[model samples]
Target: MLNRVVLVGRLTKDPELRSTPNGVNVGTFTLAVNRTFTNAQGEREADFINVVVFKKQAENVKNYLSKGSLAGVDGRLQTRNYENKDGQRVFVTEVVADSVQFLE
Candidate 1:
């Protein structure tokens, strides 16, 4: 089975870094990916995707990425399910980043 995704986009916000109990570093950020085609309303749409990186990759992302900066990401799509505070089962999907490149 193959699960791979590649995207080039701009950050919507600054990357947030956190450390696990075991001292593993993690970084989370959102990317604003523009659509290839315009809608009927003649406006190009964008998809905001959440991404997470681990360890040295996380550190690199934190060191270089910033709001509105262009970046390229190579990762896998992950879906997780958990019960929310409202007692509803919530399904969340995000990209688990394996590699990242700062384009600008």
Candidate 2:
């Protein structure tokens, strides 16, 4: 029943910040993590993961991190469905961060 997850990676792009209509702060960014193993070609592969943060921590993300900044995120996985403007259902999987550790 444990849903906790932790990830350490470099930011693939600058953090995107926004506020909800109700005035809650939110931020999102993608992390690129290199796999622990090498491929047959002796090359390492990376996984791009989407992360979201809320509250004061969301503002902190904007002020502290940027492209290539190393970070460690502590959070849990979440999946939700939404209807796009085109009227199709879309499901998204991402990490909802509780705290972000700025390793840079």
Candidate 3:
């Protein structure tokens, strides 16, 4: 089985950088990825994807990228589940970035 993700999109917000309890650098952000085809009824829509990076890449991501910045990401697809306050299980999917290209 293979789980990989490659995406090019615009940032929806500024990247967030923080340190984990392990004292490791971590960054998180959202991307607005556009589809190739436009809807007949209206303009093309976008998929909002969550991305995470670690270590030096995390610092670079926070320093270089901001809201509305275009970026390309090569990463792995990951899925996890957690119980919310409502006592319902929620499944989430995200990309664990290996490398990111600054694309203006």
Cα misplacement distance, residue 98 of candidate 1 (Å): 1.0
lDDT of each: 0.96, 0.96, 0.96
Q: Point out where model 2 deviates above 4 Å.
A: none
Residue pair clashes in candidate 1 = none
lDDT of 2 at 86: 90
The TM-score that candidate 3 achieves is: 0.93
Candidate 1 on 10-95: residue-level lDDT in tens?
A: 99999999999999999999999999999999999999999999999999999999999999999999999999898999999999
List of clashing residue pairs for candidate 2: none
Q: TM-score each candidate.
A: 0.95, 0.93, 0.93
24, model 3: CA deviation in Å? 0.3
Question: Which ranges of candidate 1 are over 4 A from the true structure?
Answer: none
Candidate 2 residue 91 Cα shift, in angstroms, is 1.5
